[PDB]
Design an enzyme around this catalytic site. Structure first.
Site, PDB file in Angstrom:
ATOM      1  N   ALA A  25       0.675  -1.346  -0.362  1.00 42.27           N
ATOM      2  CA  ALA A  25      -0.172   0.351   0.053  1.00 42.27           C
ATOM      3  C   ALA A  25       0.912   0.994   0.017  1.00 42.27           C
ATOM      4  CB  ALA A  25      -0.753  -0.188   1.248  1.00 42.27           C
ATOM      5  N   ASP A 135      -3.595  -5.987  17.035  1.00 45.32           N
ATOM      6  CA  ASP A 135      -2.492  -4.591  16.450  1.00 45.32           C
ATOM      7  C   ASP A 135      -2.327  -3.959  16.711  1.00 45.32           C
ATOM      8  OD1 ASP A 135       0.232  -5.680  15.120  1.00 45.32           O
ATOM      9  OD2 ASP A 135      -0.597  -5.135  13.341  1.00 45.32           O
TER      10      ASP A 135
END
Ligand SMILES: CCS(=O)(=O)Nc1ccc2c(c1)/C(=C(/Nc1ccc(CN3CCCCC3)cc1)c1ccccc1)C(=O)N2
Ligand SMILES: CCS(=O)(=O)Nc1ccc2c(c1)/C(=C(/Nc1ccc(CN3CCCCC3)cc1)c1ccccc1)C(=O)N2
Lengths: 245, 259
Positions: A25, A135
């Site tokens: 990304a 996360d």
């Protein structure tokens, strides 16, 4: 895409305005094509790269769409070109907590409370929709300035997020391990607060003598290797440290 | 007939339900001798569920085996997502067991060979199904040797992930369900043989606390059972995964490759 500009549904960005990278990304600052004072983040994701990964982008979009809180990073649009998926998202002109800590060093208890109030606000919404982030870290906690009181916090990156599932054939290890990571976020928020205060992650850990009793209570309650022992959500949400000054 | 990309179906030809889903028998609009299953999923229903349809499509796309149910196309209307998939004219194992009752060791071998074939592909791509059961195991007749098995329903499937802020319970529980499918295949073979699952409760929570307290010991293997099949079942039906038959042991187990 040789050219500088690019169009993504109702939005556009210059490739000149790259701000950072994620997994397969790249993120640009952009804007609405008519409402040009409306800045956005455009996350370009390579499809071929993704298709060879185990990233569930569909899940991340599902969760982002479901969460409409001012302390969770807003998703505005998804566009699918042949080579790329684009996510149009809240612009956070502050970068991540990691950058802010690398700059400011350690933070005052006043500062950490203002930040944690907002992280707690977001944690409410995840807990109440039965989502575990899993996360959480300073790289995932984005900052948005008005101009410390001018700093708004937004949680990002639901890559690793998962829904809590609230069967004779099912393996016993699967049956039993239901809800096993239900409290994973409370640990992470612990390590993060710790790092904010001490200036590095903790690994009971070394709580500096300066630490206020409330904040020491919170940290020791959060930093419990066994989830059984670890502070529950309602205890955290309403912890004395959060609702003082 | 209703149209879904290059495929079509009559609403007359409903063949069952899934989760927030309805399944029709269909066909390609040009290659009309090509039968398909068309799984209609209501988007509003899905959006209020915790079903990750994207994940299931991702996994189905990655698996091209003749014992894993084929996904041919995905179409997105405003109100519904459609999955165009292999037609399995046999229904699920659940229907077949409710009909046939118990199965011969010869029959169970023919079926398990094909389930093993599929398990190879999942293991080797690091996919755990996790919700293997007779409702998920479809049948496709050519004309018992004429019966082809296809695994379906990757709703609950997950990839094996082969970090200071990450909770210790998450770090450590990596690969914990790596062998979950081998248990499930166990309960299924058992039910095929005995005519009921090896362990039953009155609810999910009863069974949660049953497996929890370690009340679970080996189940009633009839004296008639062949030694190989008894070996396989006792190796598969191990409450602790540490102790439970590993994949290569299963894939190459004597029971499978005899005649
Ligand atoms: C990591 C979670 S993610 O979901 O993969 N990424 C994501 C998700 C939503 C986002 C951003 C990023 C984002 C960022 N803005 C941003 C980034 C950097 C800067 C700082 N200097 C960098 C270059 C010079 C000018 C700005 C400013 C804004 C940014 C980009 C990458 C990493 C972190 C933040 C933003 O406004 N909304
Ligand atoms: C497995 C869960 S799911 O993924 O949500 N469903 C799914 C996925 C893929 C599929 C089917 C269904 C399907 C079925 N065929 C089918 C269904 C019924 C009958 C009716 N006979 C049964 C046996 C003989 C008598 C009539 C025939 C074919 C079927 C439908 C619903 C439930 C199960 C199977 C098929 O060919 N491919």
């Amino acid at each position: 895409g040789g050219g500088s500009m690019e169009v993504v549904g109702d939005f556009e960005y210059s490739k000149r305005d790259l701000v950072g990278h994620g997994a397969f990304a790249v993120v640009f600052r952009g804007r609405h094509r008519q409402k040009t004072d409306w800045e956005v983040a455009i996350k370009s994701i390579n499809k071929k790269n993704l298709s060879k990964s185990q990233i569930l982008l569909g899940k991340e979009i599902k969760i982002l769409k479901e969460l409409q809180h001012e302390n969770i990073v807003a998703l505005y649009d998804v566009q699918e070109l042949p080579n790329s998926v684009f996510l149009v998202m809240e612009y956070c002109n502050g970068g991540d907590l990691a950058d802010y800590l690398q700059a400011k060093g350690t933070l005052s208890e006043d500062t950490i409370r203002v930040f944690l109030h907002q992280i707690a606000a977001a944690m409410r919404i995840l807990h109440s929709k039965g989502i575990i982030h899993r996360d959480l870290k300073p790289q995932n906690i984005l900052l948005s300035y008005a101009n410390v009181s001018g700093i708004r916090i937004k949680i990002a990156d639901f890559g690793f997020a998962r829904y809590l599932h609230s069967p004779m054939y099912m393996a016993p290890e699967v049956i039993m391990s239901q809800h096993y990571d239900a409290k994973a976020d409370l640990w992470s928020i612990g390590t993060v607060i710790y790092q904010c205060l001490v200036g590095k992650p903790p690994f009971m850990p070394s709580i500096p003598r300066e630490t206020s009793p409330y904040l020491a209570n919170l940290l020791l309650g959060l930093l419990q290797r066994n989830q059984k022992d670890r502070m529950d959500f309602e205890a955290f949400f309403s912890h004395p440290f959060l609702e003082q000054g």
